[PDB]
């Protein structure tokens, strides 16, 4: 929700357009039943039949550096004590710092 609401940009005709209105989402994804930002969030979160189209419509999110920083050495795996790899549910704290 927070990623889509704060850093949500659609790829409209090759341009990065902020998602400030439901009209943009309906215009670019209405053929798939997605006509609102809540529809886009639902499709992404539930991995619906049009997840490919929704995710590709979303311009790649451009996050800031985490507010609390990284671990002391961030280029090891999360298991080793770094930040790389799969941290599973623990990416939510990283997203909250980075977003």
């Amino acid at each position: 929700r927070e990623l889509i609401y704060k850093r949500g940009y659609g790829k409209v005709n090759g341009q990065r357009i902020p998602l400030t209105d439901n009209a943009i989402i309906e215009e670019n994804l209405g053929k798939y039943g997605i006509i609102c930002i809540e529809d886009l969030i639902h499709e992404i979160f539930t991995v619906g039949p049009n997840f490919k189209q929704a995710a590709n419509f979303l311009w790649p999110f451009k996050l800031s550096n985490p507010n609390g920083g990284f671990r002391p050495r961030k280029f090891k795996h999360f298991i080793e004590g770094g930040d790389l790899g799969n941290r599973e549910e623990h990416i939510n704290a990283l997203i909250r710092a980075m977003n």
């Binding site: 999360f78 298991i79 799969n86 941290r87 599973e88 623990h90």
Partner: protein
């Protein structure tokens, strides 16, 4: 780090030739469940012919200390790798939880033998129920009868931003 004991139960992926495979349980001391599952797969690779790709995690649970307010003596049997071989050693700790005993064990091994986390295998952690089964003198002197001691030459707490003091501090409290 700050650890927590996890019961990790895993399983080989069921096949047509072997439905209902055997369930394997381990006790893992890890900072989090990701590391707990990683260590489980590492030890299961060591012991059985199961990998993470050919298996699955049936369960992960936290084993809390049942009496964290009771002082206990713990014996830890461990296997560790030095710079020139592998050794087994048994050590003792005085803590209120298995997690605290394991953390003290890691710190003590790092301090005395330069053993990193990667090179230590915790074979067994046991709470010594009695007193006569305490084997180390540094735990015996703590379980001595009517134990009491003073705290000599104790430095008083002074704020590090109070640069100058008008009288010389005392070390008798």
């Amino acid at each position: 780090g700050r650890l927590q004991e996890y019961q990790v139960i895993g399983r080989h992926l069921p096949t047509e030739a072997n439905p209902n495979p055997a369930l394997y349980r381990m006790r893992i001391f890890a900072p989090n469940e990701v590391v707990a599952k990683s260590r489980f797969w590492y030890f299961l690779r060591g012991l059985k012919k199961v990998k993470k790709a050919t298996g699955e995690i049936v369960s992960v649970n936290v084993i809390s200390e049942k009496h964290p307010l009771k002082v206990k003596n713990f014996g830890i049997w461990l296997r560790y790798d030095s710079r020139s071989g592998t050794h087994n050693m048994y050590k003792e700790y005085r803590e209120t939880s298995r997690v605290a005993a394991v953390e003290a064990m890691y710190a003590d091994m790092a301090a005395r033998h330069r053993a990193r986390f990667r090179s230590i295998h915790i074979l067994k952690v046991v709470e010594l129920e009695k007193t006569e089964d305490v084997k180390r003198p540094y735990i015996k002197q703590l379980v001595a009868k009517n134990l009491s001691f003073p705290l000599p030459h104790r430095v008083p707490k002074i704020s590090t931003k109070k640069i100058f003091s008008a009288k010389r501090p005392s070390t008798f409290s």
